[PDB]
Amino acid sequence: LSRFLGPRYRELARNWIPTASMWGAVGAVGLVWATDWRLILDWVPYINGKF
Amino acid sequence: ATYAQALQSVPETQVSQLDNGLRVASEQSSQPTCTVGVWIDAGSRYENEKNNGAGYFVEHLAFKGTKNRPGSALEKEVESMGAHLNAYSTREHTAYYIKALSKDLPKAVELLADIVQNCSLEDSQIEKERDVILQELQENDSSMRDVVFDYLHATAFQGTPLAQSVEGPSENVRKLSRADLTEYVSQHYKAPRMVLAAAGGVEHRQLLDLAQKHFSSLSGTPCRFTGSEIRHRDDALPLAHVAIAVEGPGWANPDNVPLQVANAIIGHYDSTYGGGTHMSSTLASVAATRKLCQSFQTFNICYAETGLLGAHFVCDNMSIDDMMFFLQGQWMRLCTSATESEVVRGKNILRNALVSHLDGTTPVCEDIGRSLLTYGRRIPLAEWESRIAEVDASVVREVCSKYFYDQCPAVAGLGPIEQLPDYNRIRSGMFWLRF
Amino acid sequence: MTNIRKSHPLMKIINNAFIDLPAPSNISSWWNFGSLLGICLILQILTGLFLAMHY
Amino acid sequence: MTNIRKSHPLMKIINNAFIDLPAPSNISSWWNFGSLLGICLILQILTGLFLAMHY
Amino acid sequence: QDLEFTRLPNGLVIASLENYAPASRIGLFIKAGSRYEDSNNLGTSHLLRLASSLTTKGASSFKITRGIEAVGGKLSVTSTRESMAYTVECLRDDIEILMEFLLNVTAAPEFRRWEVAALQSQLRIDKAVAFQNPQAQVLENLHAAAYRNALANSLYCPDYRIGKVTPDQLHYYVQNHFTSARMALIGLGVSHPVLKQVAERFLNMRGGLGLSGAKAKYRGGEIRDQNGDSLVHAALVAESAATGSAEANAFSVLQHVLGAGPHVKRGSNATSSLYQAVAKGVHQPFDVSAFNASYSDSGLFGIYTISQAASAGDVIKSAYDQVKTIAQGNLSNTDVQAAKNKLKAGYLMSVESSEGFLDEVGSQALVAGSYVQPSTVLQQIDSVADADVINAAKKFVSGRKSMAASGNLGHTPFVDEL
Amino acid sequence: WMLVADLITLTWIGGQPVEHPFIIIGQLASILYFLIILVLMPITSIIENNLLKW
Amino acid sequence: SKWLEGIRKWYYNAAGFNKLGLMRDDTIYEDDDVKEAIRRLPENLYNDRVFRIKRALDLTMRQQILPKEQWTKYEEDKFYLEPYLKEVIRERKEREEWAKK
Amino acid sequence: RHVVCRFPLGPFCAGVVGHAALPATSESPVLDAKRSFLC
Amino acid sequence: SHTDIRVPDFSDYRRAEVLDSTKSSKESSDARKGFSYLITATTTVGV
Numbered sequence A: 001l002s003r004f005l006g007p008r009y010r011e012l013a014r015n016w017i018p019t020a021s022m023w024g025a026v027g028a029v030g031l032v033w034a035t036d037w038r039l040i041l042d043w044v045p046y047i048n049g050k051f
Numbered sequence B: 001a002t003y004a005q006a007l008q009s010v011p012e013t014q015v016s017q018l019d020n021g022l023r024v025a026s027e028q029s030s031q032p033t034c035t036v037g038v039w040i041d042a043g044s045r046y047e048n049e050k051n052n053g054a055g056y057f058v059e060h061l062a063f064k065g066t067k068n069r070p071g072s073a074l075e076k077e078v079e080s081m082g083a084h085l086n087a088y089s090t091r092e093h094t095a096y097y098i099k100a101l102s103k104d105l106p107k108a109v110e111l112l113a114d115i116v117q118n119c120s121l122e123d124s125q126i127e128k129e130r131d132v133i134l135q136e137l138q139e140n141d142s143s144m145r146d147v148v149f150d151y152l153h154a155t156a157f158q159g160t161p162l163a164q165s166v167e168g169p170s171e172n173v174r175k176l177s178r179a180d181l182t183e184y185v186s187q188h189y190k191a192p193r194m195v196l197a198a199a200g201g202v203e204h205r206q207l208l209d210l211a212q213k214h215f216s217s218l219s220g221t222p223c224r225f226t227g228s229e230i231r232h233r234d235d236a237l238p239l240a241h242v243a244i245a246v247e248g249p250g251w252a253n254p255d256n257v258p259l260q261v262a263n264a265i266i267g268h269y270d271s272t273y274g275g276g277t278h279m280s281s282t283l284a285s286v287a288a289t290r291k292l293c294q295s296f297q298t299f300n301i302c303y304a305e306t307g308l309l310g311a312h313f314v315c316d317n318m319s320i321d322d323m324m325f326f327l328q329g330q331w332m333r334l335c336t337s338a339t340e341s342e343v344v345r346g347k348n349i350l351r352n353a354l355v356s357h358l359d360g361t362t363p364v365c366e367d368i369g370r371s372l373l374t375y376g377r378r379i380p381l382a383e384w385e386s387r388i389a390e391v392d393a394s395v396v397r398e399v400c401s402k403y404f405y406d407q408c409p410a411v412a413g414l415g416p417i418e419q420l421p422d423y424n425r426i427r428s429g430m431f432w433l434r435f
Numbered sequence C, D: 001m002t003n004i005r006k007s008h009p010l011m012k013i014i015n016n017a018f019i020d021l022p023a024p025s026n027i028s029s030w031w032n033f034g035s036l037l038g039i040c041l042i043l044q045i046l047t048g049l050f051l052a053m054h055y
Numbered sequence E: 001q002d003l004e005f006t007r008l009p010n011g012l013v014i015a016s017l018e019n020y021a022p023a024s025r026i027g028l029f030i031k032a033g034s035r036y037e038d039s040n041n042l043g044t045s046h047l048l049r050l051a052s053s054l055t056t057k058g059a060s061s062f063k064i065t066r067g068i069e070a071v072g073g074k075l076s077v078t079s080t081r082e083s084m085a086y087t088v089e090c091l092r093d094d095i096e097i098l099m100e101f102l103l104n105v106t107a108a109p110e111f112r113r114w115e116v117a118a119l120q121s122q123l124r125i126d127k128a129v130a131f132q133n134p135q136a137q138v139l140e141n142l143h144a145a146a147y148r149n150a151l152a153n154s155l156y157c158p159d160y161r162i163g164k165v166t167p168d169q170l171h172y173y174v175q176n177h178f179t180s181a182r183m184a185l186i187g188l189g190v191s192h193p194v195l196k197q198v199a200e201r202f203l204n205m206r207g208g209l210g211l212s213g214a215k216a217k218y219r220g221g222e223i224r225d226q227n228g229d230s231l232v233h234a235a236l237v238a239e240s241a242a243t244g245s246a247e248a249n250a251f252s253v254l255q256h257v258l259g260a261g262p263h264v265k266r267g268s269n270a271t272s273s274l275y276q277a278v279a280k281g282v283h284q285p286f287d288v289s290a291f292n293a294s295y296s297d298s299g300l301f302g303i304y305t306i307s308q309a310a311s312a313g314d315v316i317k318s319a320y321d322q323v324k325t326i327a328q329g330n331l332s333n334t335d336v337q338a339a340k341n342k343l344k345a346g347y348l349m350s351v352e353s354s355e356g357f358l359d360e361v362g363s364q365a366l367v368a369g370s371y372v373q374p375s376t377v378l379q380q381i382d383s384v385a386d387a388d389v390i391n392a393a394k395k396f397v398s399g400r401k402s403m404a405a406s407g408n409l410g411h412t413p414f415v416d417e418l
Numbered sequence F: 001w002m003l004v005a006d007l008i009t010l011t012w013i014g015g016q017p018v019e020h021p022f023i024i025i026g027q028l029a030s031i032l033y034f035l036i037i038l039v040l041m042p043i044t045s046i047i048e049n050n051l052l053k054w
Numbered sequence G: 001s002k003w004l005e006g007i008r009k010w011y012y013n014a015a016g017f018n019k020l021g022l023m024r025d026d027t028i029y030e031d032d033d034v035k036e037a038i039r040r041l042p043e044n045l046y047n048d049r050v051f052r053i054k055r056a057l058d059l060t061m062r063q064q065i066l067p068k069e070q071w072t073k074y075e076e077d078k079f080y081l082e083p084y085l086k087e088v089i090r091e092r093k094e095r096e097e098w099a100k101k
Numbered sequence H: 001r002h003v004v005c006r007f008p009l010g011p012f013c014a015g016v017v018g019h020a021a022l023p024a025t026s027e028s029p030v031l032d033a034k035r036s037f038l039c
Numbered sequence I: 001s002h003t004d005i006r007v008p009d010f011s012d013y014r015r016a017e018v019l020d021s022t023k024s025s026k027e028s029s030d031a032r033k034g035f036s037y038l039i040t041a042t043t044t045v046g047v
């Protein structure tokens, strides 16, 4: 995959790293919300009222 | 000499002002020939629905005769000198210029004054020009690009003067009388709203004293951009024309510099281009490879406080959709992922366009007049190069996001445009879910 | 290049069925029920399946 | 006139899948098993169904 | 400074002007064109002109395209009937780069079968685009009718030759016409020693004085095209003098006497004698000018008229009558002086631009082998007498006529009827 | 064919109990399966490519 | 090198495509580069390749082999496709390297 | 002058736009300028 | 005959922010898109 080992792809990554990080947070928040992890929801100020 | 040294050696534009407000500008270049013209800050956007064709009508009969050179005499005089007399009028500016030997600078200037101030509108001449203009409209219909751009202006700036075409409605042309044209000339052809520009063999002092001799005897609404579409479905036409734009910046907005660079990245293509599939522009390469487009081009049409920023393409019946897709995708790339190498290429393209467009006395005069009308000053090529050098990938991404990403566009279609995507689909294409 | 939605086989089928299908602009609410039927069917398949885990 | 096997929609699908499908001429017996799998699947359904009538 | 003109030992001619402009423009003018094609390689020059971005020995097609577009430069080929000019224009700093590409395009082309076969359809596309305007078709028919060979060949590939231009024909054409003595390297914004060095590096392998075509033989025929268009385009010409002669200056002055083109937008062309002569009896949309083609061995002078289908004969006869009246001596000195002023102004305006100056210097280097200052050109222009113009008009009137027409015809006369 | 014989060996051992020879033969068989599929086959293909001069 | 030549000849004989009358470049997997190289082949070479491949397919259909003296000889095997494929791969590498910048 | 550019009209009759490759052709003065005055 | 056509009056359908033709829409674009996407976001939260 040396085709992608170039300066442009390094720049391309930096442009999309913030976006990928944001989508990762959506997945993290979604997983915690859907599964009611409660390892993480205990820290959340208002959600921790439940359980 | 290097490129920077060559830029710094470009002769500067000398600007003076008459006592009545006329701005006299010149760029001497030591040539046997010279262009001298008058650029008036009058056009379609200064007209209402009652006289929407006044400016074009006046331009049509500007050379047909004056109070001092009745009938064809004026023309003969110009033709006697070997000078070429030309004129145009856009939605925002009017211009009457003469290309002539520098030795013929005085007479030419005199003629221009006579054309601007002492214009004689003979009633028979007015009727002749009315018939000519009606036939000109019937011929203008044949020109598809002009029709599609007029549709784009009408839909984008609907309810505002910018929606009005330069020529105006045929009914308006028929109604226009000598009184309307005289009133339009008296209101708009005023010294503070005109610039006398010259380039070539002219000397600034000579031009200034000539202007003081002839032009001394002279008189002392932010438009709303609307995302909409006009579809003129006509399956009989061989090809479909599409023009899609978004609200752009004004003349004075700095963002014009990076945006042009952005357009330079998108580029232009035509079926007669020899670059083919190897074109640097990804959209141009795709269009050449897939035969998606006969010709496409990005445009940045700026006005005083607004503008149209987008593209226009000619496509087959079954290709429009695809082309639009790729076009929009290109925009999105610039809004989200623009790299340094392509930005450098676009900057080089813009530098070449700027330096190349200013080759010739007539282009330099047009640049001087238009710059004085719009910017109020002549921007030297050194300043343009500095502004271009300020542009990088981050600036391009930011400006494209400001003007392109998630914006309502104005679309004009013409011909077999059944495949032209619905406006909801185009609007959805104006943003990326991944981003 | 091409468009994955209009090129990929499964994507071609889906795009021509539910995405770029030319549809009349004036079909009233009475044309919803068709899709509703499908919805109902899927529901009956899902719900019923979960009844088959205990029946 | 036209040929039903080439024009009718379901007939078009069936013809392009199993009748007029261009197939390599040198494929050996090892290419049968694919179809065999299908047969097994069909069998595993039919037989299976007749086991569910009593299980 | 001034123009640095120089002739190399092999015959190559390099000229350089340092105007200190931010943009640099280099052209290579080659004495190759449709004139140097025979009946067996018709269309080769067209494909060669379209093949400026194919793979070469030094660089590939992708490399050429991407390198030229990266610095924003432009590479264009302008092919007239007896010359072919390549030209690269870009910024002053990057010009050297493009220079290499340029001399890879011409000195060391590499026509690969697949690339040429892909390019074949571009011939049809380009010819259709060119023929979108009737003037091109009328001129091609006019040159076919006027001459028997050489200049008879059109600027565009014949339809039957669209897919039949082999790479071998292109190689033969380049080898036999892209030679040192037939070339000229002109530069604006380029130092003379750099241009000489690049010429030595590339434009030295091929020995000069390549294959030379025959002299064009005047035919005086006719080609009438019935295409049903509302407007009839007609061109009626006769053999004028070759370029560079005094009689050529007389013919140009005569053309500007009759009227080459308008000088006022939407003007009545009052000083145009042909326009006024036609207008006196024709009250329909019309246009008439003096066609003047000047070539190395011969030339054509005549009248070109766009007219209504039912009024074409009247317009053609009126223009011919005006030219005949001028031939009989009805030519005022004031009119000659005005035409000389128009000619001088037009020439200076033409050379005013960078493209105009480049093509003018290239043509001068390719025809006369030397550069002539515009002052000398003006002096030659004013040296024409009224007698000379009258004699040129006489030669047109009393010479074998060749005519090409395109439109509904029906009311368009024939060469004999004129 | 070594891979096929290895799969047959794995099936046979999966049938057999977890005792002295079967444990070690199964470990070796699994290692050989993954080695053949991952390491040996690409290297052998590269060797064949070099033997065919391409 | 003589041992290398011997083992190469042995492997060529072991790889039985010569037994089908084929040449080495006929057996190459047609990826994008190979497809382009085939599309760049001159007409005579393309026709010869197509006929050789069709004959090999016909032979493999009947599970038969070409007569002993008709097998492609190792020393007279021509790498007709190799230059075209090399050029195509070089062009692809150049395009990728440009994209890297 | 020794160019086929005799008058502004005619030469550069059919020149196609382009970038990095833009062929053009040049015939001789062929009128059609001021023809557009009337339909 | 392309100049005698004018876009019909959509003022009866325009939002109150874009009713005046002498006022730019760049200022109200953020508000309008925010309103529409807030409706969409609340819908998505409920779903």
Ligand code: HEM
Pocket (backbone or CB within 6 Å): C041, C044, C045, C046, C047, C048, C049, C050, C051, C052, C055
């Ligand atoms: C169009 C599709 C279907 C229809 C119209 C349908 C209809 C019905 C009806 C009317 C009942 C009677 C329920 C009652 O009286 O309480 C029922 C029960 C049942 N169905 Fe469905 N059904 C469908 C699909 C399915 C599927 C796909 C499955 C399993 C995968 C399934 C499994 C069951 C089971 C196990 C019961 C008995 C459980 C119970 O009665 O509560 N059904 N179905």
